[PDB]
Design a protein around this ligand. Sequence first.
Ligand SMILES: [Zn+2]
Lengths: 89, 98, 116, 173, 483, 78, 72, 76, 75
Amino acid sequence: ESYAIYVYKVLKQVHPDTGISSKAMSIMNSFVNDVFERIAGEASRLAHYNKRSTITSREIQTAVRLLLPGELAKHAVSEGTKAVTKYTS
Amino acid sequence: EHVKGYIYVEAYKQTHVKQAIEGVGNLRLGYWNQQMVPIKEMTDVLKVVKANLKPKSWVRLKRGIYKDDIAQVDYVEPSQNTISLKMIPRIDYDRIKA
Amino acid sequence: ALETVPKDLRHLRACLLCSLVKTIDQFEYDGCDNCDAYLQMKGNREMVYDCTSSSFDGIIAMMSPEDSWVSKWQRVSNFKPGVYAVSVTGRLPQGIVRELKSRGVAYKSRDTAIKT
Amino acid sequence: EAFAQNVLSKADVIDAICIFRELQCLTPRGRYDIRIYPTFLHLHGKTFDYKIPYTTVLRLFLLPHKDQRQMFFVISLDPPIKQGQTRYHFLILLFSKDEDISLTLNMNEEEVEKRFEGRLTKNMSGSLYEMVSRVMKALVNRKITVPGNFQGHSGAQCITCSYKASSGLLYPL
Amino acid sequence: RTRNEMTAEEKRRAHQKELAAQLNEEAKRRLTEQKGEQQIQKARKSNVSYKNPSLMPKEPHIREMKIYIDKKYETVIMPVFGIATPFHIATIKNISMSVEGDYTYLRINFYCPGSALGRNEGNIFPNPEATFVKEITYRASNIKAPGEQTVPALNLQNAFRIIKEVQKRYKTREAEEKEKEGIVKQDSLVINLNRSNPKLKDLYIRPNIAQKRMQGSLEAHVNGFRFTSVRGDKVDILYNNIKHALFQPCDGEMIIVLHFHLKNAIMFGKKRHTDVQFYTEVGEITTDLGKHQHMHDRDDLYAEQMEREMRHKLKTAFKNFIEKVEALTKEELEFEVPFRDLGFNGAPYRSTCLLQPTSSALVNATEWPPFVVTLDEVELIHFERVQFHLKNFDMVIVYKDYSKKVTMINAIPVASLDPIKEWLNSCDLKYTEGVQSLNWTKIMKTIVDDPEGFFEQGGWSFLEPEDETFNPSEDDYEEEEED
Amino acid sequence: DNIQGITKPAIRRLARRGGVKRISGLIYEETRGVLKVFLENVIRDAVTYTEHAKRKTVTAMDVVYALKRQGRTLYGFG
Amino acid sequence: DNIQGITKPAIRRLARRGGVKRISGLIYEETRGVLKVFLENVIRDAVTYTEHAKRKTVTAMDVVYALKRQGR
Amino acid sequence: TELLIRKLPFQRLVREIAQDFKTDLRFQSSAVMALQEASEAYLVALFEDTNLCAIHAKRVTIMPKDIQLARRIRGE
Amino acid sequence: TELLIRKLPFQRLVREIAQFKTDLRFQSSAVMALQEASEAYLVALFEDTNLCAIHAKRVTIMPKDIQLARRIRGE
Ligand SMILES: [Zn+2]
């Protein structure tokens, strides 16, 4: 499987009047999997450091701030905060 | 370092040093006599009067042209090969010698 | 031992803590023997030139500090046998002397000589 | 060939044992041919030339390259060949393992047997470095030193190290 | 949601389109105005030892058949079986001598096809199909004859030395003549009738007048500069000849330099040069520290204070000199301070250095030889090897004068790509991109051969620029599974 | 062997795309050796992952994981 | 301004400990800049870890985690 | 774009090293393509580093010593 | 164990550059670990610099040596 359907949804939402290529979709899926893996590995490291048995939103935020650059990390943190708020709402 | 002629030794009896300084060819002169100093001279031998290498001090010269003159230390060289020195020149600016 | 006895009279320095007089090559290779863990003087000439100082006078053939008035006076009874001195003019930097007291090493002035 | 034939038609030609043409030298640098003589060797260059008697040779060293693709052939000289304001204490040659050769001596079978005591033959073939080593051995009588029982971590027979502001290879003989 | 960062790059692209239009128009105009022009060509002739036998020497060495050398005529006469054959020193390529205890060998190599390696390749022989004498070897016994005068090998040694000397002199004279041919005569230095004349002192010159640098001073004259070494070597550089004046301060450098890029070449130290520099050092070099060590708060920080004071004084003196020269010349010669912030690492002569773009020239003076590119003569720029998996790219500067070689700068960190683009955009220079390295030699040759057809195809615009997709089909519109 | 199959023009083209203007004769053998070492390490890691997954054939996913372990992620084949 | 306070003799000592047989006059500013960059990176990582741990004091453990993250 | 390494020789080398490791193995076409892409990228990066070393050494011709210095400074 | 940089200037520099988040204490052990790491890092950098200099056939390291070392390293 892959996140192709979700990537296509995001693409139609950001630019409803454009397309993509097969190699482009594959590169996007590879990027999604790689970002997921990096964040998950960083979260596992932080959880092992804190001696916790559950990855939390705080752990994910720390992992994001450790991986992504400054402005991009701040924007991602804001998006995740809004998302978790709407979820808990 | 200030004395130059005789050394000292720490021992209980004289026979100890007499038999210990046996065979050496340098101390052969001072071998037939072992002098004993009072107990009051057991602390003045370690006294040094003011080593003597500190920057921004005053030092005299014994060679060159600036003989019997005082000068100031400016930069020490722990390399032990040279050393700076502040001293007003005494030359003639090249107008006397042929 | 044969490692602490000075080899060549030329180029010789002395420490300020225990006043260990040896040769520059010995200080560079082996370094301070009486105080190594709390000095790291071994393994480089840099720390040697930083701590030790060639401004020292006196030579005493220390062989029995446990039983010797010179050692009891000079406060070197808890040191190993060797060739020490009776005066060493110098002082360690603040950063080098504060760590001694922080770890538990009393810093004393070995310059027993007088001034003027 | 025509000029040579015209010259031979009028001259009365009556020499070197073997002539190696163009051998990669590192010290000195450049391509040099080597002519062999019973008592010396002529190192001919495009400009400079040298002549090394066998009496001046001290040792012959055959070493491999770190990458296991080349061979160093070192000749220790004494006195060192002089060139202006420089003296060379070693003659270094570089060969490739895949550089074969087929040599034929300028002597007869019996004469070669009497001279080299059968160590050489009228016609030979094999690796270039092997040929040079065999010839120099049969000529000088000194045995060619070879690497010892040393084998670095990289499997090579030497260690890459610097010296006098220059990288190079150190071989424990 | 997305960051949403905009890009003036579109304004940059529009400005670059305008620059490309103007560039094509101006290039077409200049090439049509040129339409080919006159040329220049000189002559030459081989060397001759003696034009006639009557000019041959008559020496006892020649009589005894000894290798003779005539210096006034620059010829070497050698014995060839009772024949004293001469050869001009130019024919000889080099000579070597060897001693073999019993005998001494003297080898003499001439020039010939195949052996004309180096800067002599252009010296095409008048008949390469003829027979060339490539080597001649003579042998002289080292044994001194019974109570005779000299030794035969002594004659060969003397001959070797004299031939080397004659060859040195001949090559020196030939180099001097070749470098003098083609120099633009400069006006005489109007000696300073003005009594003021600004002056600066303590300056090492590049290139070196002598074998090594010469310390000296500089003085601004009415129509130029006069550089005088401590000995007395005077070098003149007229103002009108100065094409660019650069001032590289010591801010982050070991030398404060004044560089002069001249329109024409000036000859000094028996050599002509196009670039000059007058610098003063403010650096230090040691095994590590001073081979001593003890440096506390009385020499180390004091040394730093002294270094800072010297740097400040030199900067002040250089600024004063610049202002005085400007005020005296009435803005006829303006100095340029390079913008260090807009610099980037490059390798023009294949040496990592920091090129700095002034306000009308891309320069670099700290590293010798200097680099200077006047932006007034730049046709365009091309970035080659600009891909994703390449941390370094190359830049190619094409001059308006197509008869010149394009300037190629290799190895430039990709982080310094957009900055160079913005700098060129401000400079009004058209920059294009290329994924592969092109053969600029062939390109320029073809453009010079067919400029009109070149423009008809498109001019320099040539540098500028199937498969389906996994689309969300019905199989992709499938929903998820139940809980 | 097939290590020599790597054509001299192919190595020259790789170096050109990199940014080398003049190559030496001793470069081709060295480049072949370095490439062989890199491929050997990648195949080692890939075969380890294949034995872990208990698969009969190496896959693009295993190759990508090996490249990631080395430190040179590669997209496209995911 | 403590990047200058870092005693140049200290840099010379760090460099002299191996192979470095001679140094230029500009090595000091270059080494200072490189040390500044490395310290900035390590301290950013450690500060991130500390803010995650909530503590208001950076610890040797946080420094070790930052170093391991950087791969030192 | 295009591949700089010859597909058939590269595939043969991959199969040779795979058989050297463990015989009776099989690789996918996409796997071989990914290996070739990774190898080309690695070689290009190495060539860029070697060109920097040669530039620094004040030369134009790249040398095996430059490649060795590049690999060393990289840490392989 | 061995430290060449003065701990007081090093600590001052750390607190001056740690202004990313003003007001933050650094334990003595934390500062010591940072100093050890910095000393080891600069030591490795100078080793690579010496390699680049030996390559360039110059016994005196120059800033371009360190620049090349860091470039090849990927800093
Ligand atoms: Zn001590």
